[PDB]
Amino acid sequence: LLPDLIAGAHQNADPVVLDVSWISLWFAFNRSFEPTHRNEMLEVAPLIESVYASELSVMKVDMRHLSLMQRRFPDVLIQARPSHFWKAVLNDSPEAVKAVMNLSHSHNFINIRDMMRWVMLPSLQPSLKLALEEEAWAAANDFEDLMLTD
Amino acid sequence: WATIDVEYREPAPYVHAQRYIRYCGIDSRELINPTTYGIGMTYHCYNEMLRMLVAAGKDSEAAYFRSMLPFHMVRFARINQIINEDLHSVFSLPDDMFNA
Amino acid sequence: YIAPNPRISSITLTQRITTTGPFAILTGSTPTAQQLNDVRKIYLALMFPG
Amino acid sequence: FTVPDVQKILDDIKALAAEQVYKIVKVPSISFRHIVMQSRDRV
Amino acid sequence: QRPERIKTTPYLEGDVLSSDSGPLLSVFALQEIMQKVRQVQADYM
């Protein structure tokens, strides 16, 4: 963080800047901060953390497997684009994970290349739902088991 | 400043207007198949403007413009798509007068 | 015509603390009739280059 | 305090943490069934 | 139905301010062009 501030490079996370007045410095010097109530979510945070990671991993696996359908079946998906399957995957994810991501994607722009790089990254959080989803995709590798053919 | 904003690709249906307009070096197909990451989108004049603003000590305005840049370029890409596709007609100006 | 997202120029860290944009005085203004007509003129000039 | 939208998000995640995926059964579901005709030897 | 109009991130989503079309803009341009010359010829001998 510090060497980037001196060199003026904005290719990484940009720190947030806040504005204060002059007399606020004296007022802050003459006032200390004494915590009197710890947060109600300290002991619940790890479970939320694990749930968030598991949902992200499930989304990654689903996209990774859906990205090959255009190459596999040219006739059905002749006019398909990556945004189509992106939107399709987003329509089945939970709303909470989408909201957490939108907290940052509201004022930072991303496109197909960023998220393709994200889904090619090798990191998953193992869980029950993730393992069963991976096995489900492996079982449904052959479309003949999905009862549709040409 | 250092961008080619008028090009020629393939013979148009109207033989008197062959040109294609590319404002700020962006193409319409970048809305479908982008060629760079979201943070990497830029062009020459906008980059020089941010550098000069930073050198002048106006950091907050530079941050605002850097945040607003992709919206600006998407707007100009949409304008390019409207010009090159919908407005192609016999009433469009021929190439010689446009050059002159 | 579509306005930009209001969250581009401001981030709310908590209930009381929010970042402030430099041009907040201009972003609060509302155009009249003549200013809107001038905006339409600007876009018309953009869409026909020469 | 905190923004009510973020509190709503955290409440939704906490609710989702208790969703039940598997089931506990005494017998598995039927996978093969048989159709009977006028024959007494083949189905 | 067009792939260009698909929005997947709320960055490009915003409020609606106004609308316009061809049959309005053409007559608007003609009105402004004629009004300018009428004003100029009225202001001076």
A59 chain-E contacts, CB cut-off 8 A:
none
Distance (Å) of CA A122 to CA A60, A119, A126, E23: 10, 8, 12, 55
Contacts of C47 in chain B (CB under 8 A): 79, 82-83, 87
Count of A–C CB contacts within 8 Å?
A: 15
Resolution as reported, in Å: 3.1
Kindly provide the residue ranges of all beta strands, DSSP E only, lying in B18-82, ordered along the sequence: 20-21
Within 13 A of A141's CA, how many CA atoms are on the CB side?
A: 4
- What are the b/e assignments for B30-44, b being 16+ CB within 10 Å? bbeeeeeebbebbbe
- Does residue C32 sit in helix, strand or coil? coil
Taking the C-alpha atoms of residue B36 and residue B40, their distance in angstroms, rounded to an integer, is 6
Which amino acid belongs to residue D29? Answer: S
Name the residue of chain E whose CA is nearest to C4's CA: E14
D5 lies within 8 A of chain C by CB: no
Going by C-alpha positions, the residue among A10, C25, A6, A113 that lies closest to residue B69 is A10
Neighbours of chain E (3+ CB pairs under 8 A): A, B, C
Distance (Å) of CA A11 to CA A26, A101, B8: 36, 20, 35
Q: How was this one solved? A: cryo-EM
Q: Which two tokens stand for residue B88?
A: 């192609």
Residue C5 is nearest to which of A16, A19, A107, comparing CB atoms? A107
Q: Least CA distance to B73: which residue of chain E?
A: E12
